[PDB]
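User: Structure tokens for this complex, please. No commentary.
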Amino acid sequence: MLFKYIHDVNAKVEEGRRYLSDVVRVALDKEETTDPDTQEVTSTSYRVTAYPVVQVGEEEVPYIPVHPKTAEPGQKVTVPTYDVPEKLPVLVRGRNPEATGDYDDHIWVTEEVEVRPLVDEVFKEDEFEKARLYYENVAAQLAEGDDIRHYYRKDLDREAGHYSVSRYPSF
Amino acid sequence: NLSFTDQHIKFWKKIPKQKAYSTVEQYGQLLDYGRSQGAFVGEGVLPDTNDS
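Assistant:
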């Protein structure tokens, strides 16, 4: 992971089905396709992703102080580690099959659902700056304090002003 | 006279004429109203954004 970013979302965002966790990780990494016969790269690409992660442990990293603070030559700080979970819980209304009356019929039950990436995009080798802009835009959208809303990319859109093709139903 | 007269000019007398104020003239167009997305959203769901 060339770039990595950890953001803490609020209760309104966590309530959604796409943000069932409380921490979001944004990453940018480079992929290489290797020739099966001999080690020789054939194609290269950059990937921008975003997953809801959960804490699994801790580790020690160098301390980087900010303006008011000052650090020792060998000062270190401990930060948590994150991983992508397989499933996350939800709370949905239900009914008790063996309710004896009118007071124990309606209840709440918990279910597990599959976790899917928030963002998954692929960029070519000669488009590093566009990938960097996309990653920065995702980070800014998360910093604004709401859900990720803009996924538009100019390269993958259909032509504009071609009335003979855009007249067909799209809903 | 074995050649044409003025009455044989048709297109030049019918095309509308507008005065020009510069060697370069500019005008703007509206290509489309939006993209081909979906419109159905759901109860309490924020709709997608769109641009012209």
